[PDB]
Design a protein around this ligand. Sequence first.
Ligand SMILES: [Cl-]
Ligand SMILES: [Cl-]
Ligand SMILES: [Cl-]
Ligand SMILES: [Cl-]
Ligand SMILES: [Cl-]
Ligand SMILES: [Cl-]
Ligand SMILES: [Cl-]
Ligand SMILES: [Cl-]
Ligand SMILES: [Cl-]
Ligand SMILES: [Cl-]
Ligand SMILES: [Cl-]
Ligand SMILES: [Cl-]
Ligand SMILES: [Cl-]
Ligand SMILES: [Cl-]
Ligand SMILES: [Cl-]
Ligand SMILES: [Cl-]
Ligand SMILES: [Cl-]
Ligand SMILES: [Cl-]
Ligand SMILES: [Fe+3]
Ligand SMILES: [Fe+3]
Ligand SMILES: [Fe+3]
Ligand SMILES: [Fe+3]
Ligand SMILES: [Fe+3]
Ligand SMILES: [Fe+3]
Ligand SMILES: [Fe+3]
Ligand SMILES: [Fe+3]
Ligand SMILES: [Fe+3]
Ligand SMILES: [Fe+3]
Ligand SMILES: [Fe+3]
Ligand SMILES: [Fe+3]
Ligand SMILES: [Fe+3]
Ligand SMILES: [Fe+3]
Ligand SMILES: [Fe+3]
Ligand SMILES: [Fe+3]
Ligand SMILES: [Fe+3]
Ligand SMILES: [Fe+3]
Ligand SMILES: [Fe+3]
Ligand SMILES: [Fe+3]
Ligand SMILES: [Fe+3]
Ligand SMILES: [Fe+3]
Ligand SMILES: [Fe+3]
Ligand SMILES: [Fe+3]
Ligand SMILES: [Fe+3]
Ligand SMILES: [Fe+3]
Ligand SMILES: [Fe+3]
Ligand SMILES: [Fe+3]
Ligand SMILES: [Fe+3]
Ligand SMILES: [Fe+3]
Ligand SMILES: [Fe+3]
Ligand SMILES: [Fe+3]
Ligand SMILES: [Fe+3]
Ligand SMILES: [Fe+3]
Ligand SMILES: [Fe+3]
Ligand SMILES: [Fe+3]
Ligand SMILES: [Mg+2]
Ligand SMILES: [Mg+2]
Ligand SMILES: [Mg+2]
Ligand SMILES: [Mg+2]
Ligand SMILES: [Mg+2]
Ligand SMILES: [Mg+2]
Lengths: 163, 163, 163, 163, 163, 163
Amino acid sequence: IMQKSNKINDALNQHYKLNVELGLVYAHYAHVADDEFDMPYLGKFIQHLSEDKLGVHKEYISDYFKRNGMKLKTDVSVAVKSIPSDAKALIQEVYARENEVRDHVKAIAKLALAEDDYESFYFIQWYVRDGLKDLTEVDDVVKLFNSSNDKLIIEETIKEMVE
Amino acid sequence: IMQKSNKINDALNQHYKLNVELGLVYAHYAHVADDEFDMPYLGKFIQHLSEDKLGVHKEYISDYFKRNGMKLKTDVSVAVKSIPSDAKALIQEVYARENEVRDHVKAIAKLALAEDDYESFYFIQWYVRDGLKDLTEVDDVVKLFNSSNDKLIIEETIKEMVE
Amino acid sequence: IMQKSNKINDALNQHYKLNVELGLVYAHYAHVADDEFDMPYLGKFIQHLSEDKLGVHKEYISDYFKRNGMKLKTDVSVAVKSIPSDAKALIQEVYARENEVRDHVKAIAKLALAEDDYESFYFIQWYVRDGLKDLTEVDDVVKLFNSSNDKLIIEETIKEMVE
Amino acid sequence: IMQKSNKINDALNQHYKLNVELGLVYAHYAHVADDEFDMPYLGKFIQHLSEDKLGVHKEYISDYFKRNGMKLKTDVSVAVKSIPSDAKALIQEVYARENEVRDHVKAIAKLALAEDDYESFYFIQWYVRDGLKDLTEVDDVVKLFNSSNDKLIIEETIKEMVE
Amino acid sequence: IMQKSNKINDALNQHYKLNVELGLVYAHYAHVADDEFDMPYLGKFIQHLSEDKLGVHKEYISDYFKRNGMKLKTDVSVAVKSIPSDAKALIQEVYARENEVRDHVKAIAKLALAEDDYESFYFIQWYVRDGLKDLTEVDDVVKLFNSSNDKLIIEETIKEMVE
Amino acid sequence: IMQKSNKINDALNQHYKLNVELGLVYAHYAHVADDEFDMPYLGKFIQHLSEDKLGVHKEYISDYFKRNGMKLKTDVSVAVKSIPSDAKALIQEVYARENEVRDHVKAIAKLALAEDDYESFYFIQWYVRDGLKDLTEVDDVVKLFNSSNDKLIIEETIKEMVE
Ligand SMILES: [Cl-]
Ligand SMILES: [Cl-]
Ligand SMILES: [Cl-]
Ligand SMILES: [Cl-]
Ligand SMILES: [Cl-]
Ligand SMILES: [Cl-]
Ligand SMILES: [Cl-]
Ligand SMILES: [Cl-]
Ligand SMILES: [Cl-]
Ligand SMILES: [Cl-]
Ligand SMILES: [Cl-]
Ligand SMILES: [Cl-]
Ligand SMILES: [Cl-]
Ligand SMILES: [Cl-]
Ligand SMILES: [Cl-]
Ligand SMILES: [Cl-]
Ligand SMILES: [Cl-]
Ligand SMILES: [Cl-]
Ligand SMILES: [Fe+3]
Ligand SMILES: [Fe+3]
Ligand SMILES: [Fe+3]
Ligand SMILES: [Fe+3]
Ligand SMILES: [Fe+3]
Ligand SMILES: [Fe+3]
Ligand SMILES: [Fe+3]
Ligand SMILES: [Fe+3]
Ligand SMILES: [Fe+3]
Ligand SMILES: [Fe+3]
Ligand SMILES: [Fe+3]
Ligand SMILES: [Fe+3]
Ligand SMILES: [Fe+3]
Ligand SMILES: [Fe+3]
Ligand SMILES: [Fe+3]
Ligand SMILES: [Fe+3]
Ligand SMILES: [Fe+3]
Ligand SMILES: [Fe+3]
Ligand SMILES: [Fe+3]
Ligand SMILES: [Fe+3]
Ligand SMILES: [Fe+3]
Ligand SMILES: [Fe+3]
Ligand SMILES: [Fe+3]
Ligand SMILES: [Fe+3]
Ligand SMILES: [Fe+3]
Ligand SMILES: [Fe+3]
Ligand SMILES: [Fe+3]
Ligand SMILES: [Fe+3]
Ligand SMILES: [Fe+3]
Ligand SMILES: [Fe+3]
Ligand SMILES: [Fe+3]
Ligand SMILES: [Fe+3]
Ligand SMILES: [Fe+3]
Ligand SMILES: [Fe+3]
Ligand SMILES: [Fe+3]
Ligand SMILES: [Fe+3]
Ligand SMILES: [Mg+2]
Ligand SMILES: [Mg+2]
Ligand SMILES: [Mg+2]
Ligand SMILES: [Mg+2]
Ligand SMILES: [Mg+2]
Ligand SMILES: [Mg+2]
């Protein structure tokens, strides 16, 4: 009784992998935003997202598995082989990835209900809302680039968001 | 003038890769120590080392590169395909890896002097001592396992080290 | 991907409309409770519900739409053409309306699951419980009128609820 | 003796209606300013005006009527069927409406004197000055749009006004 | 409209009964752990679980029923006719019972969705997570017995959990 | 020497049973007082008595047995199959039960002296006085119902007793 769902186990290991590799790409993007595009505050915004993906986003799954018998799998593979050409494109790529995270999370909630796994429906509840919150935070930045053509104006505006 | 050394650049990208992948293995080892071997405090010790490897150990290189023109490379590949059979072997494997870190750091200091790159000799100075400090911290744990045959005694002793 | 559900959009615009118009009726009922029925504390209870319906009940939908791409619609039409004959009937009408709110909210949760829109299932989670809470608060008042035949006793009891 | 003026009663019910419907349009305009025009601070300025129109602007009339025997009428009808094409036009429309409020208030003061209703001349005294104050606050914003062509500069300036 | 589900009513009365009778068994187990097995801290851990089952676990259902019209039923029958032979078996029996609680709670969430009773799906949300939390707390104790063969070591470790 | 009296053991297990089952009936009565009879403060008075019967009233016996070698017996059987018709009758039934508690306690003191069990005469000393105190507290409530015919007056008076 209460035997863990292998489908849910797989999908949460997949999501664990996604957050690790995303966090590694964002750590690189954070470096580029500062060093190449001369936007250190944009860099700290993306670093904070990097530490988020590699922090609680992965630890919550780790900690959930210890409580329910699911097995953790560490299989990580990510290479940053090209970088967007400028800062706007850099944040827009981050947006496109965060929008995909929402879709992965939605598949997990759907599957949890399909598996009658209400503990896992509950756990994913945090990820459902962080999907929209993280995406909204990124969107608030993508936008600055369509409201000003001045890197330093945009930077001053980001400073009050990464406070 | 002051053109960055490509050899040093390569070796620090290699060390960046090492700290990322180590930190990912330790995050998995931390989970196993708690869930499988019933040692949550041993798990928090190894988690703290995981967050260390994936935190300042990699960020210092990232931040150094922004200051000197070296290029950051994100090429990460690590899979945890087997786990040591028990807690002692788990910490002993961590030890063997930390001992290899000391040797990688030593090659970098040697090369920095060979390149007349005293900024990089200086930067590695932090890593020279953290090599011995992290290894000594791990050693203090490996030992508990040869001083007591009681998991709970060992655990109570680790609690006062990960405070 | 992640395209907003038009059905959910419509139903939340409908619920937005419901909360605005309810809040306008309650503002009028609050005035009547004080001026005509000589019950100022009953009036402050109903005013607080009015400011609730016209405050967070509508703003949460507004703010949700900005985050997910749904479109806000402002189409408001309400006239208070008759008033209940006394204070008991006044609060009983408020009750009947709050009981209908629970049913509207329930249709939205049902539809969110039917649309596989777990972000919207989550958002409505707040409204599911406020449906019962607001209805329970109103019920605690409707009752005073069956426990005492003294307007001033009832009023003294409401004072400790709208504190 | 001291029988309430029906003309004043009608005109204050009309002004009550005006403030409700204005506040509903401004709540929608506040949403648009943030979501569509990417100006969240402009949105908070207009939200504050919305809560003003729907708050004390209407409650003062409600409370006045309880004291003098005038009858409250709730007859509300407003639909937002088109939106100004950009942020400047959005605030300019708000201005045009606030300028009309001054004229409605002026008719009420004129009528109060014509009715020898000095209690109502006094009550409207608050609205006479808030007509100019609210209009001046809106004007301070309309202007930013003629002093800078940078959305983010304008936004940073509004932030210090909606504090 | 909004008529309470009799199926949900029955299942929550059943769960009410389960928590009462569990709490009575645990109160007895707490006594035995201290008096017979000489483990007073193990006793305080099990007493805390007893007061939990007989406290909020039952009161939340009681309070929920007052709000939605469901009827409370008090039909209680439990006799402790044998006790596990030692402390390990005692906590393992507690574990087996807590694991069954998770399954009862899961049937209630399933039924709430099947009944389109989202207020009851929401209410059970608390029980879904306390099912795993209480079971995890008990598991943390069952384990001590496989990590040390010393009653007093185990006891010293429990003291820091029932703090 | 100092061998525990089996008669006293039996009578205190009987009293343990009485306090458990009373506390379960009072928990149900507390719910009814609030939900059906619209008297939430009367409900909190009876809940406090419920938590008393199920708290120290039973734990003192449990703790006494650990100290003297008497054996705890958990044999519980109570069903609430009918409820008094109104609030007065509800509190009067509670009174009749508390009056029986005094008589059970008196038999235990008598028996303790007859057994020359002065430790048990001493322990029951607490129950002798709580018999009169709890009964006096209940009596102070039964009375309100003969001094006012207004549910809300009675409720306001209970509020200052369950503080
Ligand atoms: Cl590659
Ligand atoms: Cl996208
Ligand atoms: Cl699915
Ligand atoms: Cl592989
Ligand atoms: Cl080694
Ligand atoms: Cl070298
Ligand atoms: Cl009409
Ligand atoms: Cl109804
Ligand atoms: Cl539906
Ligand atoms: Cl229209
Ligand atoms: Cl104008
Ligand atoms: Cl005039
Ligand atoms: Cl039996
Ligand atoms: Cl089990
Ligand atoms: Cl079902
Ligand atoms: Cl029966
Ligand atoms: Cl009696
Ligand atoms: Cl006797
Ligand atoms: Fe760079
Ligand atoms: Fe910098
Ligand atoms: Fe954040
Ligand atoms: Fe570009
Ligand atoms: Fe996040
Ligand atoms: Fe500033
Ligand atoms: Fe595991
Ligand atoms: Fe743990
Ligand atoms: Fe450290
Ligand atoms: Fe070994
Ligand atoms: Fe380190
Ligand atoms: Fe210590
Ligand atoms: Fe009136
Ligand atoms: Fe007043
Ligand atoms: Fe409230
Ligand atoms: Fe009537
Ligand atoms: Fe509400
Ligand atoms: Fe009072
Ligand atoms: Fe919009
Ligand atoms: Fe925003
Ligand atoms: Fe203002
Ligand atoms: Fe224009
Ligand atoms: Fe104003
Ligand atoms: Fe400033
Ligand atoms: Fe015993
Ligand atoms: Fe003791
Ligand atoms: Fe607890
Ligand atoms: Fe055994
Ligand atoms: Fe619990
Ligand atoms: Fe200690
Ligand atoms: Fe009831
Ligand atoms: Fe209540
Ligand atoms: Fe008391
Ligand atoms: Fe009667
Ligand atoms: Fe008592
Ligand atoms: Fe008082
Ligand atoms: Mg199904
Ligand atoms: Mg040389
Ligand atoms: Mg489906
Ligand atoms: Mg004249
Ligand atoms: Mg269905
Ligand atoms: Mg004698």
